[PDB]
């Protein structure tokens, strides 16, 4: 229909609430509401996420208890920030994350309250480490198919939408759905203290403790895996000396003949762990 620039802001707590609540109830689509602030025409800013309670034991079925609305928003009024609801979410846990018939069913009833209340889909399965996968959508009408649907200001967002993407059925659901870009702004305070946590708190408390424990390893436990290393670096070696012989025998470097390889580099890296933690001994133990 009449479109605008497509842009969705986040909160950093949001994504975590999404993944936790969509993981803890995984095989059934778990309803959840979404809370934020309509700043303007084209950007929407979710700032808070609270999950919905569950009901009877069936896929995709959803409800909005209004006493839960009143009491939850009341608690968030006596919490420091009360703000306006901005939409909702659930998961499509086993697939390529398209809104189902029940999803568009609650969308045509939910769209009469808010215009740009954006439906969002988290998936805790098709993301491993380098995917969110954040996936939000927006419903189109059927009355305005006499008119066009195609102003699409700031053209980059659409061409960006077609790349994160697959299916025959998403391709069948470019009707009734046009997505919207999601991006991420991060507090440098929060970024730096998450860096504190996950580049400092993977090192452990007082920080001497586990390195002196490695120093405990280096004179009691290492010699056993050094015996394992020496037995490997005899047994693997007397047959990997057959390998340049057979390289001279068969061809100049053709296809893979069979199972084994050199594999020594990994065992040598474990020996490098041995020497570095043996270097730790002088440093820690003395002074």
């Amino acid at each position: 229909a009449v479109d605008t620039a497509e842009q969705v802001y986040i909160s950093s707590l949001a994504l975590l609430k999404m993944l936790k609540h969509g993981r803890a109830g995984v095989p059934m689509e778990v309803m959840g509401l979404m809370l934020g602030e309509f700043v303007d025409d084209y950007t929407v800013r979710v700032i808070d996420v609270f999950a919905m309670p569950q009901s009877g034991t069936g896929v995709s079925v959803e409800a909005v208890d209004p006493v839960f609305q009143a009491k939850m928003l009341d608690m968030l009024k006596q919490t420091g920030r009360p703000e306006m609801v901005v939409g909702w979410y659930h998961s499509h846990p086993g697939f390529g994350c398209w809104l189902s018939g029940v999803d568009i069913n609650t969308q045509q009833s939910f769209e009469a309250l808010s215009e740009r209340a954006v439906a969002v889909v988290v998936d805790p399965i098709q993301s491993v480490k380098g995917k969110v996968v954040i996936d939000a959508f927006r419903l189109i009408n059927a009355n305005m198919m006499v008119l066009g649907h195609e102003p699409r200001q700031t053209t980059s967002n659409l061409g960006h939408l077609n790349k994160p993407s697959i299916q025959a059925l998403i391709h069948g659901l470019n009707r009734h759905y046009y997505s919207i870009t999601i991006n991420y702004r991060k507090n440098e305070l929060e970024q730096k203290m998450l860096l504190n946590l996950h580049k400092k708190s993977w090192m452990e408390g007082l920080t001497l403790q586990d390195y002196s424990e490695h120093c405990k390893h280096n004179e009691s436990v290492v010699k056993e895996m050094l015996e394992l290393a020496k037995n490997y670096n005899k047994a693997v070696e007397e047959e990997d000396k057959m390998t340049p012989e057979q390289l001279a025998i068969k061809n100049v470097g053709k296809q893979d003949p069979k199972r084994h390889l050199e594999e020594h580099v990994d065992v040598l890296m474990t020996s490098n762990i041995v020497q570095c933690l043996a270097a730790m001994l002088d440093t820690v133990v003395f002074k």
Binding site: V26, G56, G58
Partner: protein, 50 residues
């Protein structure tokens, strides 16, 4: 009470049939390997309260 029992039926019309199978063995803490009785094998997961 007709409306009550038939509304229970009305809510109940949305349940989904579920596949019956047997578990071959356990791979990991979350990965499970089953066999559908009609046919092929699979690799599945559990719920969180099982």
């Amino acid at each position: 009470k007709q409306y009550e029992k038939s509304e229970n039926d009305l809510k109940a019309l949305q349940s989904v049939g579920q596949i019956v199978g047997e578990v071959l063995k356990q791979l990991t803490e979350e990965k499970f390997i089953v066999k559908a009785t009609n046919g092929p094998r699979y690799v599945v997961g559990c719920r969180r309260q099982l």
